[PDB]
């Protein structure tokens, strides 16, 4: 299932405890792409189907390859889309713990959105996972204004985007195992750290 709009479709009277917002890579389908579904499945196993809402960044985020060369690593329209989703989560479910993630252009999108986000909302994101982080070198493996302890970066050796080049090499397409194990493990651990249980 490459398309998930649980936050947009969800009833505010029955908010999930955890809301995951994820940005796909360049040219990927739906709003979750290749890695999102694996992460989602594992989050559901941990918090139960009604305990977590999975929301992909769709709308104006078209994941156009060329946009990864723009100043922030994605388009302004895409940043506004993801910011809007964080704002919707905050208003619809004030008590939900947030988590986020992004792959390739989506990782730059996640970082830019989190950087611009109002601190009160940003501080609700218990953990963020980034795969093939295009701004890894430039930002020294961090997301501006966001704590290192809540950030996990998956950058493969040989993935040129992690060392400053906008070129797609084989290691950039090899994040499947991470999305199936360590990424959801990290997100689950970070949520439990603040929510207990």
Swiss-Prot record:
It is found in: Secreted. GO terms for biological process: carbohydrate catabolic process. The 2 disulfide bonds play a critical role in holding the catalytic residues in juxta-position; reduction of the disulfide bridges results in the complete inactivation of the enzyme. O-glycosylated; contains one mole each of mannose, arabinose, N-acetylglucosamine, and glucuronic acid. Changing residue 26 to A: Severely decreases activity on p-nitrophenyl butyrate. Disulfide bonds join 15-93, 155-162. GO terms for cellular component: extracellular region. May have promising applications in chemical and textile industries as it is capable of hydrolyzing a variety of substrates including soluble esters and insoluble triglycerides. Can hydrolyze and thus modulate the surface properties of synthetic fibers such as the plastic poly(ethylene terephthalate) (PET), or the textile fibers polyamide 6,6, polyester and acrylic. The active site is at 104 (nucleophile), 159, 172 (proton donor/acceptor). Optimum temperature is below 30 degrees Celsius. Optimum temperature is 30-40 degrees Celsius. Its EC number is 3.1.1.74. Inhibited by n-undecyl phosphonate (C11Y4). Inhibited by paraoxon. Optimum pH is 8. InterPro entries: AB_hydrolase_fold, Cutinase/axe, CUTINASE_1, CUTINASE_2, Cutinase_monf. It comes from the Eukaryota. Keywords: Disulfide bond, Glycoprotein, Hydrolase, Secreted, Serine esterase, Signal, Virulence. Its main location: secreted. SMART domains: Cutinase (SM01110). It catalyses: cutin + H2O = cutin monomers. One of its GO terms (molecular function) is cutinase activity. Belongs to the cutinase family. This is Cutinase 1.
């Amino acid at each position: 299932r490459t398309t998930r709009d649980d936050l947009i479709n969800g009833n505010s009277a029955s908010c999930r405890d955890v809301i995951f917002i994820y940005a796909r890579g360049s040219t990927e389908t739906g709003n979750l792409g290749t890695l999102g579904p694996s992460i989602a499945s594992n989050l559901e196993s941990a918090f139960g189907k009604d305990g977590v809402w999975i929301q992909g960044v769709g709308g104006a985020y078209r994941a156009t390859l060329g946009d990864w060369a723009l100043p922030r690593g994605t388009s302004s329209a895409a940043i506004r889309e993801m910011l809007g989703l964080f704002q919707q989560a905050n208003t619809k479910c004030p008590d939900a713990t947030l988590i986020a993630g992004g792959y390739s252009q989506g990782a730059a999108l996640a970082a830019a959105s989190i950087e611009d986000l109002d601190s009160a909302i940003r501080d609700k994101i218990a953990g963020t996972v980034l795969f093939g982080y295009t701004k890894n070198l430039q930002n020294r493996g961090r997301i501006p204004n966001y704590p290192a302890d809540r950030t996990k970066v998956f950058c493969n050796t040989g993935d040129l985007v992690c060392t400053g080049s906008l070129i797609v090499a084989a290691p950039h397409l090899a994040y499947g195992p991470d999305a199936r194990g360590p990424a959801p493990e990290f997100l689950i651990e970070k949520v439990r750290a603040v929510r207990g249980s």
